[PDB]
Amino acid sequence: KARVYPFEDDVEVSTGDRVAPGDVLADGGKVKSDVYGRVEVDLVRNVVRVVESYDIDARMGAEAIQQLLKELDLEALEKELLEEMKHPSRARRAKARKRLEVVRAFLDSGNRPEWMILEAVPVLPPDLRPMVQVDGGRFATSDLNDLYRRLINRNNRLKKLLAQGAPEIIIRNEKRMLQEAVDALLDNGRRGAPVTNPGSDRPLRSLTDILSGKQGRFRQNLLGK
Amino acid sequence: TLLDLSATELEQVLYFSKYIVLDPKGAILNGVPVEKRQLLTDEEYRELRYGKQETYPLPPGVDALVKDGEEVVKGQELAPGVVSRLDGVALYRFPRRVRVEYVKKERAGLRLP
Amino acid sequence: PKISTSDPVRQYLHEIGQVPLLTLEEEVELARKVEEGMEAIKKLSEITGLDPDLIREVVRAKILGSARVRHIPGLKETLDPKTVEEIDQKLKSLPKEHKRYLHIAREGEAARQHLIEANLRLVVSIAKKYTGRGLSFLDLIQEGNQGLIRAVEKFEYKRRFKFSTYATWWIRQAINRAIADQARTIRIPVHMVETINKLSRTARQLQQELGREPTYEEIAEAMGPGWDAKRVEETLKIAQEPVSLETPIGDEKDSFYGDFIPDEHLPSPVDAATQSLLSEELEKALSKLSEREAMVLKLRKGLIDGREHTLEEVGAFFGVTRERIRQIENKALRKLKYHESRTRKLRDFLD
């Protein structure tokens, strides 16, 4: 489905461009285009095809999400919920009133709802995750230290792939793999944990496991210093 | 909570299965101008920001329309019997047969009684 | 809301089935657009005077760049703002016979995008056999994918190689050098991996050929001419995992491996105090000394640099050198002996 347009001599806008309506498409502003779409510019037969298509900012990833949370206005969503407040009562208030309290507490601290989404990942100082040598020229290290490596190769491999300007399908798969990665570092087990490839199927003690002493560490905690 | 996005909704946007919109202006197969939110899949997206396209195969036979290899109306027949379910532009691909017709002109000698 | 979670594998493989195989003619035809597009890109940079690397971006920043123009332009390393158009505005404002190249460049880059997509299953079909060998199935497909990209760049369609069995090579290469680079908590040279990957092969034969487990002597005389007995031991120490600080210890519940590993870098309450009473006695030992009977040893030893053959050459600001500095540490080092042997302050700080 494409509105074809033929040209006599001159032609502006190349294949890949996005047009309409009444936009100068060819011949010093004679042949214009009506409908929205992707331009084709047939090299052989002189006819600039405009393929029936929109241009929609419709995104996946926490990128899309991160945006919304900037684009959100609290002030608004507080008072706009204050109208939602106690009007259907037993239905679309009971939930729309819980929603409110968050906005309030968000507004009570001074946190932009975007700071929940991560773009700069901090990294635990190295000493409390050491790489010590023990016996027989063999070392010992943390899971944290192996959780970070697997993250980076993926962010690093993304920079290559994005630089390369590869097809979106694969630009995606790497981001999926990057969410999966940051997940398993921040809190490894909330989606089916990864392990030290061969060795055993022991899940890797993630910053989450570490803080709440998930594996018999909070029971060890109260065994004191 | 803060985005009236469900539990499951939040997945398909954060783990890459359904696109959440932000700025649109469009309505295909819905007839509905889809608003500044809410999710849609690949074969939905590959229709909106790509367009409706369909390729079709053939055995070693004949075209029966590439002479009219420019335009087509829904269900129009071509070749031995193919019919495309789309209303737009029919287009050539990989030519195997091309006839070259050589227009020539000479001058004749005559003598009638 | 739990129907399925571990989709990343399945999810991809079903997105992957969406794109169909190419004809022995489609493959060809798609490739021909790119080589020309690559030339066109030069042809443009020849006329514009702009750079091949740059044009290729500003062209991609349209065929892909509906949004692809990166959110932050590499923190301003890259430029993606109003700048993009101005370049594609110059490229649009070419005379027709040079301009024609742009429309080849667009078609090529577009053809590039396709040639990748259509062969992405080939990556999967190969990276599947490479699985478990240190690295994840996805992590392999992703590597192999850019092997499949690399194949596309360094390729000429004129030599009518079967592209199916062509990229196959590039693909593996990318996976192999990936495995050797990533799949270990300690980075190791690529030939150093192959040394151990020869061992791993060699060990299995000697495990069955001898019945028992072979020795360090047994392996060299089978590995290669220039191999030692003592050697293998190092290539095996090197080969290991290693141990996880987060390994639990016997009790299983509370104690982890790391719990029992002491410190020895930091000074202890006894040490630190000693390594500050030794000092507070030195400013109570050579404090009643010359600022050259002390400062020479505070340039030799009191400022950390050996000064074996560094102090005799340099005139040391204001003094005398030659056959006298090798006796100035007889003016300085041998002065400290008596006040140490009489009032025995420093005797015990040895052990």
UniProtKB/Swiss-Prot annotation, chain B:
Superkingdom to which the source organism belongs: Bacteria
Subunit structure: The RNAP catalytic core consists of 2 alpha, 1 beta, 1 beta' and 1 omega subunit. When a sigma factor is associated with the core the holoenzyme is formed, which can initiate transcription.
Functional note: DNA-dependent RNA polymerase catalyzes the transcription of DNA into RNA using the four ribonucleoside triphosphates as substrates.
Family classification: Belongs to the RNA polymerase beta' chain family.
Protein name in the entry: DNA-directed RNA polymerase subunit beta'
Gene expressing this chain: rpoC
From Swiss-Prot, chain C:
Region (Sigma-70 factor domain-1): 6-41
Positions of region (Sigma-70 factor domain-2): 115-185
Keywords of this entry: Cytoplasm, DNA-binding, Sigma factor, Transcription, Transcription regulation
Start and end residues of each stretch annotated as Sigma-70 factor domain-4: 285-337
Major location (coarse): cytoplasm
One MF annotation (Gene Ontology) recorded for this entry: sigma factor activity
Subcellular localization, as worded in the UniProt entry: Cytoplasm
GO annotations of cellular component type: cytoplasm
Region (Sigma-70 factor domain-3): 194-272
Coiled-coil features, chain-numbered ranges: none
The entry's DNA-binding region: 311-330
UniProt motif (Interaction with polymerase core subunit RpoC) ranges: 139-142
GO biological process terms on file: DNA-templated transcription initiation
Keyword Transferase (UniProt): no
Chain's role: Sigma factors are initiation factors that promote the attachment of RNA polymerase to specific initiation sites and are then released. This sigma factor is the primary sigma factor during exponential growth.
Family membership: Belongs to the sigma-70 factor family. RpoD/SigA subfamily.
Oligomeric and partner information: Interacts transiently with the RNA polymerase catalytic core formed by RpoA, RpoB, RpoC and RpoZ (2 alpha, 1 beta, 1 beta' and 1 omega subunit) to form the RNA polymerase holoenzyme that can initiate transcription.
Domain remarks: Contains 4 domains, connected by flexible linkers. In the active conformation, the domains are in an extended conformation, each making extensive interactions with the RNA polymerase catalytic core.
Stated name of the protein: RNA polymerase sigma factor SigA
Species annotation: Thermus thermophilus (strain ATCC BAA-163 / DSM 7039 / HB27)
Region of the whole protein represented: 73 to 423 of 423
